[PDB]
Every structure is written in structure tokens, then in C-alpha cells.
Design a protein around this ligand. Sequence first.
Ligand SMILES: CCCCCCCCCCCCCCCC(=O)O
Ligand SMILES: CCCCCCCCCCCCCCCC(=O)O
Ligand SMILES: [Fe+3]
Ligand SMILES: [Fe+3]
Ligand SMILES: [Mn+2]
Ligand SMILES: [Mn+2]
Ligand SMILES: [Mn+3]
Ligand SMILES: [Mn+3]
Lengths: 274, 274
Amino acid sequence: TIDWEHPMFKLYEKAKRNGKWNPADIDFSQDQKDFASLTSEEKISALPLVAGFSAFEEAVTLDILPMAHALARQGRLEDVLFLTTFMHDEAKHVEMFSRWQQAVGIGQMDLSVFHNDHYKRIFYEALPEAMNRLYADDSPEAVIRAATVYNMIVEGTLAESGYYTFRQIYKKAGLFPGLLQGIDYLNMDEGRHIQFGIYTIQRIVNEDERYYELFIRYMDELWPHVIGYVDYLTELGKRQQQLARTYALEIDYDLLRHYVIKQFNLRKKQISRT
Amino acid sequence: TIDWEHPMFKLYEKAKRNGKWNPADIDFSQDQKDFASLTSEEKISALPLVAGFSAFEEAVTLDILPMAHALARQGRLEDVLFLTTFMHDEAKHVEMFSRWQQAVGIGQMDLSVFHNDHYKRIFYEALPEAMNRLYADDSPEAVIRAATVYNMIVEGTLAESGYYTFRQIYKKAGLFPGLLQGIDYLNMDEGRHIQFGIYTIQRIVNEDERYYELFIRYMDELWPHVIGYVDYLTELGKRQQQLARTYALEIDYDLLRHYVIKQFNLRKKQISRT
Ligand SMILES: CCCCCCCCCCCCCCCC(=O)O
Ligand SMILES: CCCCCCCCCCCCCCCC(=O)O
Ligand SMILES: [Fe+3]
Ligand SMILES: [Fe+3]
Ligand SMILES: [Mn+2]
Ligand SMILES: [Mn+2]
Ligand SMILES: [Mn+3]
Ligand SMILES: [Mn+3]
């Protein structure tokens, strides 16, 4: 049979229990009114963060497939069962942001303008290259690098900080309750995605403590582009402060920044050398 | 955004609405008692069909990944969203049969003995070869052949006939209520899997009516192994008739056989030349 005690079978079971939410059930009618109420300058304030998320949700939905292939080819059946929940979660994440964009009237609008160079180095290179590599090279090194970029950086550092940022800004304002319900569901799903990456990296590290060094190195290789995108969104936020003024939000970009730094270092600390 | 009117987006929505069942919730306690109550010769009667299903559930969970890859690479986002529900359904199908095997005490038992040559030509060759081909060859021909073997033959002909057979035999007997609840859920999921294959084959046929001929040809190429496995299970059933006698089941293998023939021909008729 299945190995019922396998950590990824247990995570698969939790995913089924905790993954019933449906983006089609979220009421976005108030978000539509909120967005319509905003000034043109308040309207822009929110779009860079939605742009960063929308694109990556689509990217990881497509880019997790090579990991499922590689682990399937290695006969890791429980990992594959769990990854069917991962891929389905990401599909719902694509759906959720696309429903919000449609509801508030920006579906026809092209948000790529808010992807700078550092973003693109992660989104159009580091991520798809590392995942696609697994189709021809499933070595421990390749699998660690894939989980590091996908689960520890894209999800474990950027997404987690993006969820926090969303709450720090719009939950305060009382704005966009449907989007924030969605963000709460995404954040719950993301816990399991990150735990998959931790388990995958740890079980490879457990074979040969020298893989720990590779993990730390790949995290550090990506940090410059993490902070460079974060700096660029900070610059944007500081230059368009009408939403912050209108809604009495002292948006503390220094606290966000230290949260990103904090996310990055705590992901490192969830991998043990021994 | 997503194309909200796309047939596969609509199928994805139905999958979310109709795909909440969880194999971990099925009570198999009575199945355990039923199986324990059976004579050794009654015990064997049921295993060939469970053997055919268990293996194929695992095969399609792994073997649907190349289709998702190929359609993703073609930018068919709605198809991919739907296929996340397909892959997750098949994961639950693997789980369901493995839970039943565990509960009734045959988890440690090796059921490969009930796969004959015709089965293996589908299971170990036609199916994985046709699906894996999509990694390097996503031509209309390759995509039609993949959906024909997977969705129209393995699911649309063999699985559908296997669900019917399960009901024709054990629903009658009053045996194995947990397994039959599972079979009802599998059969509901399978409707969407088959509709994916119909849509995929039809939209390729729509481009060039000559692909219709390829579809019919591939169906006919596989028919000999479909019926050869069906004949071999019929032979098995006729040689071990203690369960049929004990439970007053006049198991009409000729009616099953014509149901298989019927499944095969109606799958053909769900593809239009024009
Ligand atoms: C303004 C302070 C910066 C806060 C950091 C914001 C990061 C934006 C979101 C981009 C990453 C989204 C990744 C999603 C990945 C997934 O869905 O698994
Ligand atoms: C005794 C009459 C013959 C009845 C035919 C029985 C076929 C047995 C089941 C084997 C095919 C299972 C395919 C599952 C595919 C899927 O889960 O999508
Ligand atoms: Fe994720
Ligand atoms: Fe199926
Ligand atoms: Mn820079
Ligand atoms: Mn023969
Ligand atoms: Mn996501
Ligand atoms: Mn199935």
C-alpha cells in the first residue's frame, strides 16, 4: 500500500481537510465599490503588489509540474499525492487574483509594467530554469536548488512577506475585504507548500551534510534580487502616498523590509545541517 | 484574465463543486467483516478486479502529468487549471483502493498476478508511451493518441465497465459497502475525466476532419487488448464461482461483455467527424 506514516502522506491528508475553500464563493462586490471609490492615484497604489502575485501564481502552477515528474520518476508516491494538492492550490490562487482583477475592473489592464529587472531575474529565469532542469537532471543538487528557489524564496520569503504587507496595509484601511479573505486562504495553503520544501531540502541534507552548504549558497545567490524587488516596491510606495494619506496609514516600509529580511533568515534556520 | 467561458474552466468549476469527497471519511469496518466472512475461494473472486483498478489508478496519477505539461506549454491555462482537479482526483482514487486493501487485510498481498498480457500491453506500454511522448512531441496526432488511450480507452471503456461490473456483482450481494461508496465517487469523478478527453479530441478533429480517422484507428488498435483482458477476467470469473453461488448471483458475463463493447462504441460516437 501507501506508506500511511510518510510525512508527505500526512501533509496530503491535511491539505484535503484544510483545502476546501473555493474562490468562486468569495463576495467581491464591496471590493468593486472600494476600488471605484478610490482616486486614480489611490487606484495605482495597490496594483504593483497584485501584479507581483498574479504573475507568480500562474508561474508556480505551471512550474511545479517538473517537481512532480521528478519525484514520481523516483517512485516517491506520497510526495506525488501531496503535490496534486499543491498544484490545485496554485490553480485556485491564479483564479482568486483573476476574479478580483475582473471584479474591480482592471482585468483588461496590463500589470507587467510593475515587474522590474530583479523580479524578472527570479520570475523569468531562476524559477523556470531551476524547475525545468528537473526534467533532465534530478540530482540532489538540482532538487535542492528547485525547492530553494520555489518553496524557500518565492513562497517562503516573497509570498509570505506579500501576505503580511497586504494585511499591514489594507486590513488596516478596511479596504478590499474579498481580496483579504482570499489572502487568508492563500496564506493557509502556503504553509503546506513551504513545509514540502523544508521536508525535501532536509531529507537531501540528511544524506550528506555538505548539501547544507549548497542550500545556504543558493539562498544567498537569490537574496540580491529579493531585496532589489523589495526596494523597488518600496520606492513605488513612497512615491505614491495618496492612499496612505487618505486612509491614515503610516505605512512603515522599514518594518516591511525587516520582515522580508526576517522571512529569509528564518527559512534558512528551518534547515538543519545535521 | 482567465477565459471564464472556456469549456475547461467550466469543467474545473464543476470539479471543485463536485470533488469534495475524501477517502479517509469512508467507513470500511463492514468491508473488513465481509471479507473476513468469505471463504478462501470467495476471497479470490474479488481480487482480479481490484488488481486491475489499483494499478491503473496509480498509473494515471503519474501518467497524466505529461498532458498537463504539454497543454501548459501551449498556453492552454484553463485546460491546466482543470487538470489540477484531474490529477488530484486520481490521487484520491489510489488512496481509496489502498485504504480498502489495508482495511480488509490484503495490503501485504501482491495482486500483480492478475495482470495478463493484454492488460500489460495497455498498462506498461500503450498508456505510458503515449503520455510520455508528449514531453517531446505535442503534435495534434500525439495529443489525440494520448487522450484516446487515457481518456477514451483506459477510463472511457475499461474503467466505466469496471464500475458497472462492481455494481452488477457486489451491490447485488450486499457486500463491501465502503468500497461501493468509493466506486460511486470514482464514477462521478470519471465523468469529468472523460469529458476532458472528448473536448481535447474534438477540438483537434475540428481543425482537420482527417484527425477523426486517426482517432477511430487508434481506438481499433487498442480494442484487441481491451477485449483480451475482458475475456481473461471472464475466464477467471467462470472458473471461481463460489461467491456467485453463495450469494445467489447469476453473474451474466455475456451482459458485461456487451457492456464493454457498448462503452467502446459509444466513446467513438462522442467524437464527430465534422
Ligand atoms: C513593499 C514591501 C515588499 C513586500 C514583498 C512583496 C512580494 C510580492 C509578491 C510576489 C511573490 C508572489 C509569490 C507567489 C508564489 C505561490 O503562489 O506559491
Ligand atoms: C468481468 C467483465 C470485465 C469488466 C472490465 C473491468 C476493467 C477493470 C478495471 C481496469 C481499468 C481501470 C482504469 C482506471 C483509470 C482511472 O482511474 O482514470
Ligand atoms: Fe504556493
Ligand atoms: Fe480518471
Ligand atoms: Mn538593482
Ligand atoms: Mn490473447
Ligand atoms: Mn500560491
Ligand atoms: Mn481514477
